[PDB]
Amino acid sequence: KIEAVIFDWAGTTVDYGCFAPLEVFMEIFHKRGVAITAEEARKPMPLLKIDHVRALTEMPRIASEWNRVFRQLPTEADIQEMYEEFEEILFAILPRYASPINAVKEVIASLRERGIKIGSTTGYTREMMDIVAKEAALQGYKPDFLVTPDDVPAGRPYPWMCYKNAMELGVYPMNHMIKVGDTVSDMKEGRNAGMWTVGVILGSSELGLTEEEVENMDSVELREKIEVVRNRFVENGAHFTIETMQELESVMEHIEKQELIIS
Amino acid sequence: KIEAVIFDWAGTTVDYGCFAPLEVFMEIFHKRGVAITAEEARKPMPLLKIDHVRALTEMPRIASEWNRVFRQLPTEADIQEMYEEFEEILFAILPRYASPINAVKEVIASLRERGIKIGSTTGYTREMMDIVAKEAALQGYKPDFLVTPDDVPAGRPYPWMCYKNAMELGVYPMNHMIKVGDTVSDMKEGRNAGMWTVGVILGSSELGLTEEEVENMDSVELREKIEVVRNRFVENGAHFTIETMQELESVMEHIEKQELIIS
Numbered sequence: 001k002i003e004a005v006i007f008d009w010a011g012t013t014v015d016y017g018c019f020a021p022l023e024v025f026m027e028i029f030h031k032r033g034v035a036i037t038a039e040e041a042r043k044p045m046p047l048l049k050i051d052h053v054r055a056l057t058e059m060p061r062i063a064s065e066w067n068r069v070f071r072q073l074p075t076e077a078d079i080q081e082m083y084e085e086f087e088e089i090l091f092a093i094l095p096r097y098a099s100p101i102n103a104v105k106e107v108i109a110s111l112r113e114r115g116i117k118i119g120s121t122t123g124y125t126r127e128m129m130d131i132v133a134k135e136a137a138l139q140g141y142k143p144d145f146l147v148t149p150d151d152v153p154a155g156r157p158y159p160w161m162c163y164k165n166a167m168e169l170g171v172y173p174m175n176h177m178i179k180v181g182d183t184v185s186d187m188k189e190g191r192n193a194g195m196w197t198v199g200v201i202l203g204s205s206e207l208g209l210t211e212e213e214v215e216n217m218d219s220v221e222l223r224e225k226i227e228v229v230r231n232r233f234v235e236n237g238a239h240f241t242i243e244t245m246q247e248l249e250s251v252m253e254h255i256e257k258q259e260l261i262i263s
Numbered sequence: 264k265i266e267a268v269i270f271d272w273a274g275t276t277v278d279y280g281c282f283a284p285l286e287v288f289m290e291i292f293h294k295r296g297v298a299i300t301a302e303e304a305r306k307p308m309p310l311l312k313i314d315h316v317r318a319l320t321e322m323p324r325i326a327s328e329w330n331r332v333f334r335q336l337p338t339e340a341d342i343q344e345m346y347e348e349f350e351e352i353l354f355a356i357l358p359r360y361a362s363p364i365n366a367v368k369e370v371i372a373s374l375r376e377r378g379i380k381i382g383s384t385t386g387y388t389r390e391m392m393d394i395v396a397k398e399a400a401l402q403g404y405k406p407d408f409l410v411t412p413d414d415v416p417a418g419r420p421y422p423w424m425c426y427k428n429a430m431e432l433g434v435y436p437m438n439h440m441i442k443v444g445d446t447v448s449d450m451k452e453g454r455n456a457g458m459w460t461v462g463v464i465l466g467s468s469e470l471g472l473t474e475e476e477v478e479n480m481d482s483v484e485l486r487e488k489i490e491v492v493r494n495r496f497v498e499n500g501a502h503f504t505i506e507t508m509q510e511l512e513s514v515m516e517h518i519e520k521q522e523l524i525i526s
């Protein structure tokens with residue numbers, strides 16, 4: 001039972017903290033003496049098109065600074081000539097954060113030797129993925145199949161992308177697959193398809209921490225923050241939640257032994 | 264319940280004391296020889312129109328003097344020349360009085376943090392409000408929307424301006440909005456609008472003090488002065504009466520928990 005795991009990308013498989021799409025947004029602004037927090041950088045994370053450089057331009061403290069350095073408010077060609085260079089700088093920065101998240105290696109190798117198929121879904125796009133994947137493979141990671149919002153009629157909340165990793169990999173009931181992510185949207189995806197939804201923490205978008213900024217965080221505050229993530233996953237779906245990745249091949253057995261049904 | 268807060272523009276957010284008009288009325292008179300006090304400068308205020316200078320004209324003591332300088336009493340021309348310059352010196356000084364009152368920043372910083380909208384209304388006019396807004400932005404205060412007596416068929420006594428904020432901010436039931444002010448008129452407006460009215464004291468017109476006078480005033484003296492303002496506001500429908508700005512939020516908790524109804 002459970003013949004395939006449907007992983008995610010930045011936050012799950014690669015790019016710790018899911019900063020790729022962020023850093024870009026920061027430079028675009030910082031390149032005009034604005035300076036913004038990665039904290040504000042997220043917010044409209046899903047849906048990375050121009051409207052985000054418009055929602056980030058309509059933000060309080062943001063509109064302020066901007067109007068203080070240029071002595072005026074963002075123009076229409078300001079959002080443009082900014083997004084035009086978002087895609088640009090991003091497609092050229094994505095490969096910087098395409099390394100398989102430490103230890104994810106062994107997990108995949110292992111899960112295959114045990115006869116498990118590996119698929120995936122993402123928020124990014126074909127063009128965005130044609131850059132991400134490529135680097136990943138040259139770097140050791142390459143699932144058996146991949147799907148982006150471009151392949152289906154809708155994005156991440158819906159199960160559509162997941163119903164295709166199925167067709168390809170060829171796996172009858174949905175209960176035979178596991179969904180793994182790092183965002184409430186992901187849990188909503190798995191607990192929609194009819195799959196087993198699990199949330200990763202240490203390196204997730206939610207916990208939004210850096211692969212080091214987690215070591216400097218003190219023993220009591222980290223765990224303190226981890227639970228916050230965990231709890232937020234659980235209610236949005238998540239049949240299980242894990243901190244690291246080594247704990248997934250521990251969840252599968254459980255699923256099987258446990259003997260609980262997905263309704 | 265409290266989705267948005269509608270702030271006043273001169274007495275609540277900026278000008279701690281509301282001396283912009285005052286320190287301009289007494290200059291037009293101090294430039295012609297007849298000096299006057301800021302106390303006399305502000306009998307009626309929401310009427311910054313021409314007949315305000317005319318009221319300081321037919322004011323005994325001030326009628327005296329001027330006659331003992333120009334050897335004659337004011338004329339219809341002496342007035343429509345002091346006003347036809349009142350606003351001209353106003354637009355040049357208003358920027359000097361268009362910066363926040365400390366707390367306003369931190370508070371407005373928050374509020375938006377809990378996702379609360381921020382609109383406004385004023386007695387100042389379109390042109391007057393202009394410049395002020397611009398300078399307020401460069402300083403650290405950019406409410407979501409702004410309305411002036413020019414956008415509606417009337418002034419402050421009437422709700423009109425407040426109704427405009429609702430459409431814009433998209434917060435429908437009036438009673439789901441707070442109305443902060445600094446004078447008897449601001450309360451008349453909020454009550455007529457049908458929202459939760461609140462009046463501030465420290466740094467208001469009804470207290471005509473300075474952010475140096477309030478620090479150089481007796482402990483008992485000041486307290487007495489405030490009570491006059493307080494009793495004043497309440498006497499005009501002010502559902503609440505805050506001293507400074509922090510406590511504006513505790514008021515929201517109170518209102519949301521005291522299961523009370525307006526009108």
Ligand SMILES: [Mg+2]
Pocket residue numbers: 008009010011012018181182183205
């Ligand atoms: Mg991700």
Ligand SMILES: [Mg+2]
Pocket residue numbers: 271272273274275281445446468
């Ligand atoms: Mg006022």
